[PDB]
Every structure is written in structure tokens, then in C-alpha cells.
């Protein structure tokens, strides 16, 4: 069934004077956001981001909410801590992010567990693959290391990673499995555009595909044009699917010598297409 993973992305952003730190938690199952918490509201609560999470009843949401609110307040604390660690003004805006999660094989066994922190967009501390020892990125991160060593936390966390995490992951998997395996095949077409002189540009489009992962190639008589082929980063169409393109500059009148190749997991087989002049 392939591997799986349950991760949480957390952001704490201070904003002195201008209100309380804005705090946010996002949960992903197999890189699909499924729940989210945003502390910027009169009554903030955890909420389903996948419709299939609505099978969970009020108790589930209450328990998650309360945990998130406790984290938030706790993160508000940490932010102050870090000002001191780093001897910074009380004035500035700062950021703490966290990624932590567990990934399990198709047999439901822990394949890898992790937790990395970042301060102001820079690595701060992480949990080694051994789930027992930390790794501080800078002097300040050792205060926190030597502090989590002395309250023994690499164990308390490994518990969650091997225990709670994997269990719930499995439960979430059961529920949204149908919609998680989702695949959308790219539709491809080639467009033709002018260049100066005797060159033209051929652009191979892939649209409406999901997941994001894709590969497009250009071949001159079947031999990829690795060199100076231009592409855009894969981008959301906004409706749940993605878009990408690759282009190359070819000689005018030589367009039929090139073939575009599209590889996506949704395809019974990769697409092959060419500039079609009407």
C-alpha cells in the first residue's frame, strides 16, 4: 500500500504590541492537509480540512482543540524564552516552526520518526533518527537540549512517535483511504511561440494532474534535451490539481522533429505528444 506518514506543521509568530502571537497547527496525512488550528479567533478550534475527517465526533475535536490551545500558550512562552537565549529586543517579530511526524511502511510499522524546530527560519534543534538524542544547531539550542535531557523528553516523544502517532495514523488511514489514493491524469498539449530570427519555442503543457509530482521531457528524435530546456516550478491550479510546463527553442520548420514526454503516476502509460499545426 506504499509508505504513509502523519505530520504536524506548527508556526508561532510573535507581533509585539499588535496583539497575541499568531499560532497555527496543520496536520497532514500522506502530505494531504487533513486538520488545522488557527489561534486567531474568538473561539479557536481544530477543524477538518478533509471532508472525510467529519466522521470524528465532538469529543475528538474537543480533545484536539484543548491540546492546541495549550501548545499555543506554551509557544507564546517559548518565544519569550528565545528572546533571552538570543538576547534580543522585546520589540521585534519572531518565528518558531516545528515539523514532527511519523512515517510507516505498508505493514504499519514505524519507518522513521522526527521532530525539527526552527527559529526565525533557521534550524534550531532536531531529534536524531534514534529517537533518543537531540542535535542543537547553535549555542542557544543547547540550553534547550541540556534542559530536555534533564527532564528526559527524548523518551516521552519516542513514545508518541512509536505509539500514539502510528496508532492514530492507522485510524485516519482507514477513513480517508479512498480519497487519499486519488489520482488525476495530466492533460497535455503543446503550444508554439515566436522567437527572433529562425527559432521558435515549443511549450509542453500538463494540466489538471494530482498529485503534484510529475516529469516532462523533450526529445530530439528520442534523446532527451537535458540542456537548456526551460520549465516552471509545479503550481496549484487552485481547484486541487496542478500545472507544469517545459519548453525548448527549436529551429523554424523543424518542429516535427521534437517529441514531448509526460510521466505521471495517474497515467496507464506516459504521454507522447508533438506540436500539431492546424
Amino acid at each position: 500500500m506504499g509508505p504513509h506518514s502523519l505530520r504536524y506543521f506548527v508556526t508561532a509568530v510573535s507581533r509585539p504590541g499588535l496583539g497575541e502571537p499568531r499560532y497555527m497547527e496543520v496536520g497532514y496525512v500522506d502530505d494531504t492537509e487533513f486538520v488545522r488550528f488557527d489561534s486567531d479567533a474568538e473561539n479557536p478550534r481544530y477543524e477538518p480540512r478533509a471532508r472525510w475527517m467529519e466522521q470524528e465526533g465532538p469529543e475528538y475535536w474537543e480533545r484536539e482543540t484543548q491540546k492546541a490551545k495549550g501548545n499555543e500558550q506554551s509557544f507564546r512562552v517559548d518565544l519569550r524564552t528565545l528572546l533571552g537565549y538570543y538576547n534580543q529586543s522585546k520589540g521585534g517579530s519572531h518565528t518558531i516552526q516545528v515539523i514532527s511526524g511519523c512515517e510507516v511502511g505498508s505493514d504499519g510499522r514505524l519507518l522513521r520518526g522526527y521532530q525539527q524546530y526552527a527559529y526565525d527560519g533557521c534550524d534550531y534543534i532536531a531529534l536524531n533518527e534514534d529517537l533518543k538524542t537531540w542535535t542543537a544547531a547553535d549555542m542557544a539550542a543547547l540550553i534547550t537540549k541540556h534542559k530536555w535531557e534533564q527532564a528526559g523528553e527524548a523518551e516521552r516523544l519516542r513514545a508518541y512517535l512509536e505509539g500514539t502517532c502510528v496508532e492514530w495514523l492507522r485510524r485516519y488511514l482507514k477513513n480517508g483511504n479512498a480519497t487519499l489514493l486519488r489520482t488525476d491524469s495530466p492533460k497535455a498539449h503543446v503550444t508554439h511561440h515566436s522567437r527572433p530570427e529562425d527559432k521558435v519555442t515549443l511549450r509542453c503543457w500538463a494540466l489538471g494532474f494530482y498529485p503534484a509530482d510529475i516529469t516532462l521531457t523533450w526529445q530530439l528524435n528520442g534523446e532527451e534535451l537535458i540542456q537548456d530546456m526551460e520549465l516552471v516550478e509545479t503550481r496549484p491550479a487552485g481547484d486541487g490539481t496542478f500545472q507544469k510546463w517545459a519548453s525548448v527553442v527549436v529551429p523554424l520548420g523543424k518542429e516535427q522533429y521534437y517529441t514531448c514526454h509526460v510521466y505521471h503516476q495517474g497515467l496507464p502509460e506516459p504521454l507522447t505528444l508533438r506540436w500539431e499545426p492546424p
Binding site: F37, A68, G70, N71, I96, R156, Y160, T164
Partner: peptide, 8 residues
């Protein structure tokens, strides 16, 4: 579900 985070 979500974890409880240690203080830094």
C-alpha cells in the same frame, strides 16, 4: 492526533 510540545 496532535502532540503536546515541551517548553523551549
Amino acid at each position: 492526533y496532535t502532540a503536546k510540545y515541551p517548553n523551549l
